[PDB]
RNA sequence: UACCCGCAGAAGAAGCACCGGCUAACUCCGUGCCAGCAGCCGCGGUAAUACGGAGGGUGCAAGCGUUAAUCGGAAUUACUGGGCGUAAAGCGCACGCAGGCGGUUUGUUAAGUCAGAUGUGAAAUCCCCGGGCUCAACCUGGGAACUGCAUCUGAUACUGGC
RNA sequence: UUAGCUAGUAGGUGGGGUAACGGCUCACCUAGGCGACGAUCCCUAGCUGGUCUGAGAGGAUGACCAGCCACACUGGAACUG
């Protein structure tokens, strides 16, 4: 309102709060993976999702969405969580990189590879 | 409260203007007369009186035209709570030019164009378009 | 770094001719031109405020051969070029080297006005010009490479050339192959199906 | 003169220890409003002499303790 | 209209 | 020992020097009191090549002042009043 | 010189007894390119009808604007219920720089030019409205003399 | 080495994201609220341009995508530039210290304020006009700028003090 | 959701000291000194030129390059010059 008022008790930022605190606010991080499980969405949808809980370098344990259909993945391994989150499942607010590290490619997938990570299938 | 007497004669004027009258009525302050002059000698007003002796009275003769006032607007800009002063070059225009902008500078009042080349600066006492 | 495939595929997108098939026969048409520049070319493409303005450059580009991540620059250097933004782009467009090569008929399209630019096939007032890039200055004299003079090909093309609508700020000559940039392109003496605000804005957003 | 300065005092208190104060209009870099901002400088008193609340003139010179680098030249109306 | 919540 | 010496400020291959008079101790391109000219080691036989405010120099070296081997043999190799 | 386009067609609703009935409505604005610009709502069950309806009132009711040589003059800035508008005039600096919708009633109107932001609302039907009542009270400036020259 | 001249021959060199909307860009098949997509709305329960594949198309190119981070858009802390009857928002009300602000006229002060000048505000960077590497990036000449501070000589309407 | 902080502490005088003024040190003496324009206390952090973003006012940042500073196993100290 006032100047004098804005002089006094200044205008103060609001900081903001990254979706994916999965520390650093960094790239990505590697992590244990401790279950593999299958979850259900929310109201309108409904499927099976596929979900890991995983072990964080930087001690965070999380829930981390596998996209693709089929995975490698189980008990132990050593996936790499990405970001983006995972509008349908709350609390899986990031996605285990595909084809990275101890995980698997999807199998056989051909259309927008770079993500699913594969390979060109004999050109 | 009386804090600003500056501010009440832009304001009853724009406001006398409104209510499409020919004359208003203020109790008169040298600044106020300095003003008036520059809004008459500018064209804003068909001109002033100062019939005040013990209690300085002063009136503002008000121009029209077709449907509508001389003054499409007019505001305060230094006022009592935040005062404004400008160098020679930072002198603001109003209307890229068409329309005076009152700075009183330490040689008498002025216009923005005026004190422009005028060479000099000072405060700026309000906005008329 | 340069377009290598369906060329004509384009010129129907743009619903126009780009200048790119000009070789012998000039003035395109033969091959379908309009009513399918895909698999639904047929269709009525209605498209948005943004279609006809992104259409517009994507235009620009083809016809001359350059690129976005490239194009950009020049827009934002026309930007702080004083004036008309929109027809200095275009003043910058022009003055491309592979540009004046096509333009002052010493090739076919301005595809073959590169594959020498780039062989090293031409010059400037002397140190023979590698750069497809090459930004003519005014006086600025080209020439056809002494070297690999008149060949197999780049006479077939002055025919055409010659008897093209003739540009109007170039002194090119014909068995001497060697132009000038007499000046700067104007507004006037240039255009079509180009428009220049529509480009103009597209990189105000 | 070699740049000269008022100010009003702030005790009498202290024995050859006076300190001062100085007003200076001020515009807030963003707000634009006018600000008062003060400055205490201790200054040198020789012979302890204008008392408190009095203004005087001021002059920037060689340390002579901890922190007291200023000392009077003249001393300009005695009620405030 | 409304998802997840609404 | 204030000495007149050159900056490598060219780039990769194609250097550029600059007369500077600065304290003898600090790095070449180190902290330095005024640039005094400059040396161009390209140039190619065309306009210029180098210059120099001969005229200040001396105004250093009137204070003492060390002057580089290598900035001595452009006092001289560009004459000093013909 | 027609010069005549839409800006936006909104599908609404008018919940009967046996379910709602859609109707639809088209924003349009006319103009020439030299002063002179008008808008139009309109609506009608059909979507041309709407459209067709909407170039009617489009063309009756169109304001004289006072431009300059393609721009404005003295730097405005209008209102109307949700939406505050301002627009800078300056020599073609590129070509129109304004929002959707508050675009169309610069172009038709014939101005390219304008550095133009909307604020506010930025409902169409609103700013078209504010826009052009903000073109409207811009004072006449080669005809200043109104109040001017005197 | 940079560079210059031949030799040979298109030989030796294209991928990635995307196509329901925002957002440029379509269909078939499979599938069946399964499998899966998703940045937001939102797609899938048999004929789905939103899933996977294929065809096709679109946009970028030695890159393309994703995740991460900052500013923008966000007039979404609003000084420029926002608000509070019901949308979030006037202290339950009143007195009042500091502070903020203050009617009117003259004289004076000259601090604020203002104009000219002089120091200074490294260089580089950004910017303006040129130069040089084939171009450009890069390099470089000169200039403007560095919106600031201090000192002094003026100004006096307005503001402050007397 | 830190409101009070400080005895060499604040000043004086007087010896000593330093390259030099100086509480730097000591002795004596007045009793002060700083603080809501935010001291003190916590948390964070190398500062500037600039860098990124923005129409701008600003917001963010200070790797590479240059100026200033600081440290060089942790803590402490002097010596040489």
Redesign the interface.
Same mark, same amino acid.
């Given at each position: 309102a006032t100047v004098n008022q804005l002089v006094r008790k200044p205008r103060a930022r609001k900081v903001a709060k990254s979706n994916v605190p999965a520390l650093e606010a960094c790239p990505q991080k590697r992590g244990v993976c401790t279950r593999v499980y299958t979850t259900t969405p929310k109201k309108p949808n409904s499927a099976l999702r596929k979900v890991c809980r995983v072990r964080l370098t930087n001690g965070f344990e999380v829930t981390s969405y596998i996209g693709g259909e089929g995975h490698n993945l189980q008990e132990h391994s050593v996936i790499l969580i990405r970001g983006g989150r995972v509008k349908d499942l709350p609390g899986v607010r990031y996605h285990t990189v595909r084809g990275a590290l101890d995980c698997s490619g999807v199998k056989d997938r051909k259309q927008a590879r770079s993500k699913y990570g594969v390979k060109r299938p004999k050109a | 409260s009386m804090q600003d007497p500056i501010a009440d004669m832009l304001t009853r004027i724009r406001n006398g203007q409104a209510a499409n009258k020919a004359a208003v009525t203020m109790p008169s302050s040298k600044l106020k007369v300095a003003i008036a002059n520059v809004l008459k000698e500018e064209? =804003?007003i068909e001109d002033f009186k100062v019939e005040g002796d013990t209690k300085p009275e002063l009136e503002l003769t008000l121009?029209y =035209?077709?449907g509508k006032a001389?003054?499409?607007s007019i505001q305060r800009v230094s006022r009592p709570?935040?005062?404004?002063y400008k160098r020679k070059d930072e002198l603001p225009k109003?209307?890229?030019?068409?329309?005076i902008a009152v700075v009183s500078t330490s040689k008498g009042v002025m216009t923005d164009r005026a004190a422009r080349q005028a060479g000099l600066g000072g405060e700026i006492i309000c906005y008329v378009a | 770094a340069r377009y290598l495939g369906p060329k004509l595929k384009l010129s129907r997108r743009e619903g126009t001719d780009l200048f790119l098939k000009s070789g012998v026969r000039a003035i395109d048409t033969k091959c379908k031109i309009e009513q399918a520049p895909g698999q639904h070319g047929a269709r009525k493409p209605r498209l948005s405020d943004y279609g006809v303005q992104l259409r517009e450059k994507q235009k620009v580009r083809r016809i001359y051969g350059v690129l976005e991540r490239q194009f950009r620059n020049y827009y934002k250097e026309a930007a702080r070029l004083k004036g008309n933004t929109g027809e200095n782009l275009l003043a910058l467009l022009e003055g491309r080297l592979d540009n004046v090569v096509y333009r002052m008929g010493f090739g076919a399209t301005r595809a073959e006005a590169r594959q020498l630019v780039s062989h090293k096939a031409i010059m400037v007032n002397g140190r023979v010009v590698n750069i497809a890039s090459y930004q003519v200055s005014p006086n600025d004299v080209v020439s056809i490479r002494e070297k690999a003079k008149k060949q197999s090909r780049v006479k077939a093309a002055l025919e055409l050339a010659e008897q093209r609508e003739k540009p109007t700020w170039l002194e090119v000559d014909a068995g001497k192959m060697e132009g000038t940039f007499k000046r700067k392109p104007e507004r006037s003496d240039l255009s079509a199906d180009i428009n220049e605000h529509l480009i103009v804005e597209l990189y105000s957003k | 003169k070699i740049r000269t300065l008022q100010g009003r005092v702030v005790s009498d208190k202290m024995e050859k220890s006076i300190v001062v104060a100085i007003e200076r209009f001020v515009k807030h870099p963003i707000y634009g409003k006018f600000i008062k901002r003060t400055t205490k400088l201790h200054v040198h008193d020789e012979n302890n002499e204008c008392g408190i609340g009095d203004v005087v003139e001021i002059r920037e010179c060689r340390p002579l303790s901890k922190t007291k680098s200023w000392t009077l030249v003249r001393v300009v109306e005695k009620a405030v | 209209k409304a998802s997840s919540x609404a | 020992m204030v000495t007149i010496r050159l900056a490598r400020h060219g780039a990769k291959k194609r250097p550029f020097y600059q007369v500077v008079v600065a304290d003898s101790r600090n790095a070449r391109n180190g902290r330095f009191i005024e640039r005094v000219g400059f040396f161009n080691p390209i140039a190619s036989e065309k306009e210029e090549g180098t210059r120099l405010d001969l005229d200040r120099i001396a105004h250093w070296v009137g204070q003492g002042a060390t002057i580089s081997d290598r900035v001595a043999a452009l006092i001289k190799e560009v004459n000093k009043a013909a | 010189e027609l010069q005549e386009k839409l800006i936006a067609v909104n599908r609404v609703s008018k919940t009967v007894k046996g379910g709602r009935i859609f109707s639809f409505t088209a924003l349009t604005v006319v103009g020439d390119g030299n002063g002179r610009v008008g808008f139009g709502y309109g609506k009608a069950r059909e979507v041309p009808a709407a459209i067709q309806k909407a170039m009617e009132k489009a063309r009756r009711n169109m304001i004289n604007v006072a431009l300059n040589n393609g721009t404005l003059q003295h730097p405005v800035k209008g209102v109307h219920t949700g939406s505050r508008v301002f627009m800078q005039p300056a020599s073609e600096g590129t070509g129109i720089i304004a929002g959707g919708a508050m675009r169309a009633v610069l172009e038709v109107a014939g101005v390219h030019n304008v550095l133009a932001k909307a604020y506010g609302s930025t409902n169409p039907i609103n700013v078209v409205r504010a826009t052009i009542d903000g073109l409207e009270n811009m004072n006449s400036p080669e005809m200043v003399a109104a109040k001017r020259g005197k």
């Open positions: - | 064209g =804003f121009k =035209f077709q001389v003054v499409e709570g935040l005062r404004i109003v209307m890229a030019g068409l329309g | - | - | - | - | -």
